Design a protein around this ligand. Structure first.
Ligand code: GLN
Ligand code: NA
Ligand code: NA
Ligand code: NA
Length: 419
């Protein structure tokens, strides 16, 4: 089977990427290569990110317009409501698991060591309703601060695709096409044909993923040297985050899939091995979304309309890894500052992490910007975030795997709901 060969190549790519990275790091390291050779060494991994990011805009817009126009607005609303409930519950479970493991293992035992909450949510609302569709294709609204000793929040569009705004518009535009009737049928055919043509490009970029993944993980563990020192002071915090992702991604999420759909959940996860490893390599849910939608449609039996609707929405809203990581970091920082957390402080940590996970941009290093929001809500020192940045390169990659895995299993869950 061609799917099995792709999975075998992807598995070898991750193994070879780790082996190549340690070998390069061990033998000469980044210093021996130098900037002239380091840029070329990681370039094949960068090429995969560029190819994946180039097709996000045509895939997200056309799939959601076609997906929303292929269902009755009442049926689409029910499917969306069920998807949001699954996203909220799983994010809550990830948040609860992260706090529970952090309280149990206590990573902050040996204490050997931004944007406001309102402005963050106002930026989310501004990004949900973009002021320009063309600008939203490569820019997002962000809020900065100016001294006028009172901080005045001034806003302007920064580089970075506004996927959430494009997701919202495409769904609304798709509903408008459905309500148009016969006159909007031509546009439904156009976006479906455009979506199908883009999927042909995905199948070609799909075969380059093992080559890109190998050089993407090899370059990361080469440029991030002194790993042993990192695993010596934050080894327990990394364990809490990675074990929480493993427990939620291999025990909790598969069990939820098994309970509703009485099918093997790890057979579903085997079909999406390539996007999961791509998510690990790229550390972005947006770039691996093209491959996830490719595997979910063909490798698994998920319907075309379900996959093309739930996955683009989940790639921006459903982030189980971000919520678990933020909850562990919030408790870890609290333990470092010797702050005791009672039931009320735990509850607001769960709620704030769930809300902040929805606002996370789904981009590399994009989950630590919302970590400060949780800290101020629960009143913990923010200076300890610098520790999180040291190991974020590894934790974020684990988050991305969990961020997209819930989206795929959610598509499988909602597949049986329609059936
Ligand atoms: N830590 C996080 O989950 C941030 C988002 C993550 N990089 C993703 O794209 O899924
Ligand atoms: Na979730
Ligand atoms: Na996601
Ligand atoms: Na998000």
């Amino acid at each position: 089977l061609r799917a099995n060969l792709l999975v075998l190549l992807t598995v070898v790519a991750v193994v070879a990427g780790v082996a190549l990275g340690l070998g390069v790091s061990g033998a000469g390291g980044a210093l021996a290569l130098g900037p002239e050779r380091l840029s070329a060494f990681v370039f094949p991994g960068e090429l995969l990110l560029r190819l994946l990011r180039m097709i996000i805009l045509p895939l997200v817009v056309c799939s959601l317009i076609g997906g929303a126009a292929s269902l009755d607005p009442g049926a689409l609303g029910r499917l969306g409501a069920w998807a949001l409930l699954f996203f909220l519950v799983t994010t809550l479970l990830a948040s609860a698991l992260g706090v529970g493991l952090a309280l149990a293992l206590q990573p902050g035992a040996a204490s050997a060591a931004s944007k406001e909450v309102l402005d963050s949510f106002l930026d989310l609302a501004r990004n949900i309703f973009p002021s320009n569709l063309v600008s939203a294709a490569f820019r997002s609204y962000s809020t900065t601060y100016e001294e006028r000793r009172v901080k005045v929040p001034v806003g302007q569009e920064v580089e970075g695709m506004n996927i959430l705004g494009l997701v919202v518009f495409a769904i609304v535009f798709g509903v408008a096409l459905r309500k148009l009737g016969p006159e909007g049928e031509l546009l439904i055919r156009f976006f479906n044909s455009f979506n199908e043509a883009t999927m042909v490009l995905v199948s070609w970029i799909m075969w380059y993923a093992p080559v890109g993944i190998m050089f993407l993980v090899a370059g990361k563990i080469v440029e991030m040297e002194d790993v042993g020192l990192l695993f010596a002071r934050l080894g327990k915090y990394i364990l809490c985050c990675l074990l929480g992702h493993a427990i939620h991604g291999l025990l909790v999420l598969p069990l939820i899939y098994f309970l509703f759909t009485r099918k093997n959940p790890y057979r579903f996860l085997w079909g999406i091995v390539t996007p999961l490893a791509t998510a690990f390599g790229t550390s972005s849910s947006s770039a691996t979304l093209p491959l996830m939608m490719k595997c979910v449609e063909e490798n698994n039996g998920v319907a075309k309309h379900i996959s093309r609707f739930i996955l683009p929405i989940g790639a921006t809203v459903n982030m189980d890894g971000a919520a678990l990581f933020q909850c562990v970091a919030a408790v870890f920082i609290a333990q470092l500052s010797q702050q005791s957390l009672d039931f009320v402080k735990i509850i607001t940590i769960l709620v704030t992490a769930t809300a902040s996970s929805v606002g996370a941009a789904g981009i590399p290093a994009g989950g630590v910007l919302t970590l400060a929001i949780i800290l101020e809500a629960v009143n913990l020192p923010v200076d300890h975030i610098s520790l999180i940045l040291a190991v974020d390169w590894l934790v974020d990659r684990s988050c991305t795997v969990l961020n997209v895995e819930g989206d795929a299993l959610g598509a499988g869950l909602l597949q049986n709901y329609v059936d």
